Amino acid sequence: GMTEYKLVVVGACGVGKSALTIQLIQNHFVDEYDPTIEDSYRKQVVIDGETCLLDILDTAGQEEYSAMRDQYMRTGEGFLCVFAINNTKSFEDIHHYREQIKRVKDSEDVPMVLVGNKCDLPSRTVDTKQAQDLARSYGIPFIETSAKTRQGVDDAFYTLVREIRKHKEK
Ligand SMILES: Nc1nc2c(ncn2[C@@H]2O[C@H](COP(=O)(O)OP(=O)(O)O)[C@@H](O)[C@H]2O)c(=O)[nH]1
Ligand SMILES: [Mg+2]
């Protein structure tokens, strides 16, 4: 089979995980999507000449059983860590997601991309500099996105694939 990349989108409720995923997969902005629905979505794409499958889990937070969270973190190859640029708590929550994924995977080297979503809004509490400082500290890319306008969306997901590739080559 062509290569499949198992991607996981994490972040506080309301940051735009579902909107980002639907924009990536379907090329539409869906502005209302039940915050409690967690599902996976698939898309066949070409990234840097490679035809591959993206298998993307749009997470929604607590699970019936914590074992289910641990399972998707172990299975997942790369993580989009999403905050919203107008929600400081969502940015602070990134520290927890970074930790928890590393902890479950028992790894110091987990492909991740920091994503600051809702960049179409002038209303902003997290400046680009602050997010760059966090991404620098993690040694990962940082991309500002808008699920609404599609700015940065392919970049976020494709950059995460490229980070998975760099991890694999070791
Ligand atoms: N302006 C704007 N609103 C967004 C964007 N992404 C999501 N939203 C809105 O933010 C809210 C939460 O989005 P949702 O995709 O449900 O977030 P999730 O809980 O992380 O899955 C909804 O009201 C969306 O319309 C974006 O890039 N720009
Ligand atoms: Mg959602």
- The burial of 34, by beta-carbon neighbours within 10 Å (0-12 exposed, 13-18 middle, 19 or more buried), is given as exposed
What six digits make up the tokens of 135? 């991404």
d(CA 138, CA 133): 9
- The set of residues, in sequence order, having a beta carbon less than 8 Å from that of 113 and lying 6+ positions away, is 78, 79, 80, 81, 140, 141, 142, 143, 156, 159, 160, 163
**Resolution of this entry, Å:** 1.1
C-alpha angle with apex 10: 50 to 23, nearest 5 degrees?
55
In CATH terms, the superfamily for domain 1-170 is P-loop containing nucleotide triphosphate hydrolases (3.40.50.300)
Do 41 and 110 touch, CB atoms closer than 8 A? Answer: no
56-74 burial: b if 16+ Cβ within 10 Å, else e: bbbbbeeeeeeeebeebbe
The DSSP annotation for 92-158 comes to HHHHHHHHHHHHHHT-S---EEEEEE-TT-S--SS-HHHHHHHHHHHT--EEE--TTT-TTHHHHHH
CA angle 89–38–2, rounded 5-degree value: 115
Closest residue by Cα to residue 19 from 147, 160, 115, 117: 147
* Pocket of ligand 1, beta carbon within 6 A: 11, 13-19, 31, 33, 35, 117-118, 120-121, 146-148
| Ligand nearest to the backbone CA of 37 | 2
Which residue from 15, 17, 24, 126 has its CB within 8 A of the most atoms of ligand 1, so it is best to mutate?
15
CA dihedral 40, 166, 158, 100 (to 10 degrees): 40
Instruction: Determine the distance separating the centroid of ligand 1 and the alpha carbon of 149, expressed in angstroms.
Output: 12
Distances 30 to 26, 37, 138 between C-alpha atoms, Å: 10, 14, 31
Exp. method: X-ray
